[PDB]
Amino acid sequence: DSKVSVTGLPLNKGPSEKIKRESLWNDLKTFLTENMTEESNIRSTIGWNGIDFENEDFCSACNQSGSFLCCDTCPKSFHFLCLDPPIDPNNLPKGDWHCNECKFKIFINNSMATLKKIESNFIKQNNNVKIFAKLLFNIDSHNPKQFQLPNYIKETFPAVKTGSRGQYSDENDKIPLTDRQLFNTSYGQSITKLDSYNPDTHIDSNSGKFLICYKCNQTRLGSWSHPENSRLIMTCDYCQTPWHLDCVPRASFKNLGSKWKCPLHSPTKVYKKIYKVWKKQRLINKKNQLYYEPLQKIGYQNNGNIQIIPKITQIDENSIKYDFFDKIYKSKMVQKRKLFQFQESLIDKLVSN
């Protein structure tokens, strides 16, 4: 039928001489079946019947790509949920559709006199809300858009940055793998997941010493004439204390989504389960944070927002020592008194018999 397929030529054609040159050196029993299969309809449910201006390729309301309805007088394009009202793509507006901007402009006929007249009339009508008259008029004058927080709220917190599409990126996002575009090219097969390689993985790079595991205290390197005695050291992203994938029971190299956090970070959320919520606030930098070293250190409560020194409230080791031992001894006395109330009620009910 003459149309080329994956093989390079028509399907009803043998190999060319170039391929066979550069690729060379120089009764059955399933005839049956229509005789043995007999249908099964033993199932329980067998009762069931059964000017030429080019439009923009970004949605001007959220700056993303997709399928968008355009205006006939302005090159702005809008997704079908980013309209007022959001126009259902099943029922498109018959005729030329215009955006809110162009609709306003054509209704005013581009004459500023009619604009000021209608504005004056509108502000006259709703006298009860005279503070908002100007903006209550101006709401119907511009195209819709999605809600992006103003910069003066994203710039109050430094550990909070807007992603590539306007997404929360709270510094716990790992990194894009830039030379993992270089990874699709790669070297050969010593790939990301680090199979069969710990010369420069069980070894601290800048120092030159050994990346020990906090739980076994030995970098198990084995030998590379006996490579079944390695243990896959990975270094955390916050503390940098390296663990074996057998001490932190995880079996993977976290490489794509988040930053790995050792079991040596306290919480960052609790769920006390009796289910009360966080005790660790945000990091309010721009140098507007209140550090307050208290004048009472042994019975403070103050937050779970501690900072340790030799409103975030500073504290010292001995204060925490004393608070912890206070908790322990108060709790011990509480348990003792509970057992004592139990025993006195018991002996009273016993002599009652």
């Binding site: 029993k29 059964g50 057998d246």
Partner: protein, 385 residues
């Protein structure tokens, strides 16, 4: 609790006898996927030929299950999803530009045509297999066409458009109290697990590779919520696992499950991407290392079904399923392949053997010891059924 032990060759149990049933629809293979993407029903024709040429058809009954209707499909899915599937086709895709996004049926896993037909064939196969298992007609049902665990309730991900595993499991659960699903596919069958997360009549056990790997789900802590706590058993492994390692992990976990949970019906998913050399799967199992799992499950002697699954290299999966159907008939097949229409697929040795690679087994005994200890601690709570 892990203990490395050598691999004894597979042997047929003398007393364990059973009649099986092999469901095959002569059209399953006719529908190609769009352009050389990993799945193709074609690997169900090839396998069949071997099962015919080995003279195995005299050891069992070969049936043809009549296709599932929308009424039986909807026992898991939602109507809008089924209606969309019923009417879509490469010609009328642009008409459903919203639906294809809501249901994810026109994306990376696109619709060839016969889509509804092939899905109905697989569903009917699985359901009639479960029904014949229920009616006491046989003890094993073999359907290499089903096994689509990846499909969600109102969307298809990873090619499993219709989740016929769940339809068949419900058909089984119309009689049987407890059903045990054993997934030995390299991937995680998130469809089935999600579809039975909060129940105690269905216990899933998925031996899957974990890591930054599809579907990205199936940690060791995914143990089911609500009434289904301690009734989902995930075994996350790493690359290169081999015959002796996989055997020493599978045998004790499965023996404990069958000792405490004590299922009355088993559904074994014998997907072929967990083999060495497969297009996607990153394990290094051998053909006998795979069939050992089926032999061990069969050793228990309870009602059992064998379903297909993945498998993106047709030759290894065909030979594997042939050896599996052979072992299920209590016959260790000769490793020399008889003549079949697809002889020239299995070069250059033209033998039944699949050969593992020297891939480095990365599952250290300490990791598997900790994993199996966690899993036994979890299973301590399923003693009372």
């Amino acid at each position: 609790v892990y203990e490395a032990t050598p691999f004894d060759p597979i042997t047929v149990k003398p007393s364990d006898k059973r009649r099986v049933a092999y469901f095959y629809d002569a059209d399953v293979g006719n529908y190609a996927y769009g352009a050389g993407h990993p799945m193709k029903p074609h690997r169900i024709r090839m396998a069949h030929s071997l099962i015919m040429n080995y003279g195995l058809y005299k050891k069992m009954e070969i049936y043809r299950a009549k296709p599932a209707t929308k009424q039986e499909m909807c026992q898991f899915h939602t109507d809008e999803y089924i209606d969309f599937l019923s009417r879509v086709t490469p010609d009328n895709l642009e008409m459903f530009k919203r639906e294809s996004v809501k249901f994810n049926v026109g994306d990376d896993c696109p619709v060839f045509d016969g889509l509804y037909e092939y899905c109905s064939i697989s569903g009917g196969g699985s359901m009639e297999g479960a029904a014949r298992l229920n009616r006491g007609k046989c003890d094993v049902a073999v359907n290499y066409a089903g096994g689509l665990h990846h499909a969600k309730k109102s969307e298809a991900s990873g090619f499993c458009y219709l989740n016929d595993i769940v339809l068949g499991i419900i058909e089984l659960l119309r009689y049987h109290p407890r059903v045990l699903y054993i997934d030995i596919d390299v991937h995680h069958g998130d469809g089935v697990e999600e579809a039975f997360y909060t129940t105690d009549r269905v216990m899933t056990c998925s031996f899957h590779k974990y890591g930054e790997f599809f579907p990205g789900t199936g940690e060791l802590r995914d143990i089911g919520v609500g009434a289904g706590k301690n009734y989902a058993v995930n075994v996350p492994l790493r690359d290169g696992i081999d015959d002796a390692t996989y055997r020493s992990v599978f045998e004790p976990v499965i023996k404990k499950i069958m000792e405490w949970y004590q299922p009355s019906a088993v559904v074994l998913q014998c997907g072929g991407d967990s083999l060495s050399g497969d297009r996607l799967g990153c394990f290094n199992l051998s053909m006998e290392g795979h069939a050992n799992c089926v032999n061990y499950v069969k050793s228990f002697g309870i009602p059992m079904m064998v379903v297909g699954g993945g498998g993106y290299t047709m030759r290894n999966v065909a030979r594997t399923w042939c050896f599996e159907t052979g072992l299920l008939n209590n016959v260790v097949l000769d490793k020399d392949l008889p003549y079949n229409e697809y002889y020239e697929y299995y070069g250059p040795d033209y033998k039944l053997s699949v050969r593992p690679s020297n891939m480095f087994n990365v599952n250290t005994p300490e990791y598997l010891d900790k994993v199996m200890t966690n899993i036994f601690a979890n299973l301590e709570n399923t003693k009372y059924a």
